[PDB]
Design a protein around this ligand. Structure first.
Ligand SMILES: C[C@](O)(COc1ccc([N+](=O)[O-])cc1)C(O)Nc1ccc(C#N)c(C(F)(F)F)c1
Length: 247
């Protein structure tokens, strides 16, 4: 299983937020830690993406763009998996040192989004998503958001995305002789993948609004994140960059 061996091999390890859990919870501290954790994960998402089969085929400018557009969604999906495996969806496992209970979900002012991610977390269990399906679905997520005006080399991207879908087909067919069974599974997985997008959108909107008023609530945005929120996120929010839904 060359393809799956690679996905397993490059899967990022544990990333901590550096949050002070000995301090009473506050909006400013919780968000600063989410921001810092976001940036720490981006470092790994970039290394992960660049090590993915065929990613180098993409034009250099498209590589960066795709990573930045998919950043939020990729983190959402992996976070939901961690919440399921580590705490059976009882809380949201953003990081070992940044676990959200309902109180934190509320204090962060991201309650609706957190609840949707908890539901996603539960879905991993309800649908009995295997670790290999998770890995392949997450890679596919990276190739699920593009600009209307197109990428520099759209054809290369279309080929790569198609190949990742084919790998998902193979993983689904592995140990499934009945085509009907494969079809139902593909339906379930693509429906689950689609559900990630609306969640990332709510987080993008929240993050955008927060940055614009950051100086009013004492929230610290890392240099890199601020740039991406001000340059890339608005393209998504204004409809210039859109997710590719299956349904
Ligand atoms: C509020 C914020 O810190 C904003 O972080 C951003 C994350 C991504 C972008 N972006 O443009 O792709 C912008 C901002 C945040 O949502 N941070 C995090 C940090 C870690 C994780 C994880 N795991 C998550 C997520 F995805 F679970 F919501 C969110």
């Amino acid at each position: 299983p060359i393809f799956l061996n690679v996905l397993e091999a490059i899967e990022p390890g544990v990333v901590c937020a550096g949050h002070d859990n000995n301090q009473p919870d506050s909006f400013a501290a919780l968000l600063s830690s989410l921001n810092e954790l976001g940036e720490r994960q981006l470092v790994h998402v970039v290394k992960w993406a660049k090590a993915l089969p065929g990613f180098r085929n993409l034009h250099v400018d498209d590589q960066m763009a795709v990573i930045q557009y998919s950043w939020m969604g990729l983190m959402v999906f992996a976070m939901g998996w961690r919440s399921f495996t580590n705490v059976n969806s009882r809380m949201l496992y953003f990081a070992p040192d940044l676990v959200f209970n309902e109180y934190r979900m509320h204090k962060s002012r991201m309650y609706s989004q957190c609840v949707r991610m908890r539901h996603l977390s539960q879905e991993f269990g309800w649908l009995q998503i295997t670790p290999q399906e998770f890995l392949c679905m997450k890679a596919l997520l990276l190739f699920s958001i593009i600009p209307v005006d197109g990428l520099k080399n759209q054809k290369f991207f279309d080929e790569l995305r198609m190949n990742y879908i084919k790998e998902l087909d193979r993983i689904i067919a592995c140990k499934r002789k009945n085509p009907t069974s494969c079809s139902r599974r593909f339906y379930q997985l693509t429906k689950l993948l689609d559900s990630v997008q609306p969640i990332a959108r709510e987080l993008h909107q929240f993050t955008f609004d927060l940055l614009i008023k950051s100086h009013m609530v004492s929230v610290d945005f890392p240099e890199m994140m601020a740039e991406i929120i001000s340059v890339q996120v608005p393209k998504i929010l204004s409809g210039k960059v859109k997710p590719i839904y299956f349904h």
